[PDB]
């Protein structure tokens, strides 16, 4: 996603913690002036200004390209040496839950959680390798040129020309997402790639022309907003298994 769309997803999961999780949330964040769940939700987008070192090892793990392999996700062919989402999520995944760690260390663990979660929600995030994830597929939406990649990033949101206050809401409204009975965070990122990916491969969402207007976000704006609302909630789920275990007995 683009960052309204990862700010979105934060804001969505941050209501939905367990008060364990809240706490341990807030005292990660409170060791970072002005952090909040959403502020930090593009954080990982930003590293070639923010961090070059990191930005440049993390770049890979923004998605995984499992379409041509009708969307059934193999670790050592789609993620070698765990460079791609499903692995970067399930390793961040543990080291945030991983109280012998420093704070900061905790901290980038959750930023990378937050971002990553919304990632792998993101159909072009677990697309096509050959096209890089339909960015290499150009298309005239109304009278702007674009990519399909972008137009599913943030192109379709900007349609709502809402900002983030606006835009909550709307998501909170939809009917709620069946999630998952229980939160694994080992194998849950797998599970969403896939589903994702079979997103990407559904009827009509690569677009028989390349110009296109609202008809297309009619359809699939909602699909987009659908896919903000469920990772938001996978997301609250995974930071209430992973930070918020104990309410007794904490
Ligand atoms: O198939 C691709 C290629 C790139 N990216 C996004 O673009 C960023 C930059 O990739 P690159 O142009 O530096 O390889 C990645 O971190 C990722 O967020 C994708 O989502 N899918
Ligand atoms: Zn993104
Ligand atoms: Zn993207
Ligand atoms: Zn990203």
């Given at each position: 996603?683009?960052?309204?769309?990862?700010?979105?997803?934060?804001?969505?999961?941050?209501?939905?913690?367990?008060?364990?999780?809240?706490?341990?949330?807030?005292?990660?964040?409170?060791?970072?002036?002005?952090?909040?769940?959403?502020?930090?939700?593009?954080?990982?987008?930003?590293?070639?200004?923010?961090?070059?070192?990191?930005?440049?090892?993390?770049?890979?793990?923004?998605?995984?390209?499992?379409?041509?392999?009708?969307?059934?996700?193999?670790?050592?062919?789609?993620?070698?040496?765990?460079?791609?989402?499903?692995?970067?999520?399930?390793?961040?995944?543990?080291?945030?839950?991983?109280?012998?760690?420093?704070?900061?260390?905790?901290?980038?663990?959750?930023?990378?959680?937050?971002?990553?979660?919304?990632?792998?929600?993101?159909?072009?995030?677990?697309?096509?390798?050959?096209?890089?994830?339909?960015?290499d597929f150009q298309l005239?939406?109304?009278?702007?040129?674009?990519?399909?990649?972008?137009?599913?990033?943030?192109?379709?949101?900007?349609?709502?020309?809402?900002?983030?206050?606006?835009?909550?809401?709307?998501?909170?409204?939809?009917?709620?997402?069946?999630?998952?009975?229980?939160?694994?965070?080992?194998?849950?990122?797998?599970?969403?790639?896939?589903?994702?990916?079979?997103?990407?491969?559904?009827?009509?969402?690569?677009?028989?022309?390349?110009?296109?207007?609202?008809?297309?976000?009619?359809?699939?704006?909602?699909l987009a907003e659908a896919?903000?609302?469920?990772?938001?909630?996978?997301?609250?789920?995974?930071?209430?298994?992973?930070?918020?275990?104990?309410?007794?007995?904490?």
């Amino acid at each position: 996603w683009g960052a309204q769309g990862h700010r979105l997803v934060a804001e969505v999961a941050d209501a939905r913690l367990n008060p364990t999780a809240r706490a341990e949330v807030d005292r990660l964040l409170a060791t970072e002036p002005d952090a909040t769940l959403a502020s930090i939700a593009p954080w990982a987008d930003q590293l070639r200004a923010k961090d070059p070192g990191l930005g440049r090892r993390s770049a890979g793990w923004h998605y995984v390209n499992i379409a041509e392999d009708n969307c059934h996700y193999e670790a050592p062919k789609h993620c070698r040496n765990g460079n791609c989402i499903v692995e970067a999520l399930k390793a961040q995944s543990t080291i945030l839950g991983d109280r012998s760690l420093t704070d900061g260390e905790r901290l980038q663990a959750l930023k990378f959680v937050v971002h990553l979660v919304g990632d792998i929600h993101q159909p072009m995030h677990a697309g096509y390798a050959h096209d890089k994830g339909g960015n290499d597929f150009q298309l005239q939406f109304g009278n702007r040129g674009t990519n399909l990649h972008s137009l599913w990033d943030s192109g379709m949101l900007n349609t709502r020309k809402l900002d983030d206050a606006g835009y909550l809401p709307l998501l909170q409204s939809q009917r709620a997402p069946k999630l998952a009975r229980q939160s694994n965070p080992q194998r849950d990122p797998q599970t969403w790639a896939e589903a994702s990916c079979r997103i990407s491969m559904q009827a009509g969402v690569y677009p028989a022309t390349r110009k296109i207007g609202d008809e297309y976000t009619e359809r699939y704006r909602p699909l987009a907003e659908a896919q903000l609302r469920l990772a938001g909630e996978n997301l609250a789920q995974l930071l209430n298994r992973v930070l918020g275990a104990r309410l007794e007995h904490h």
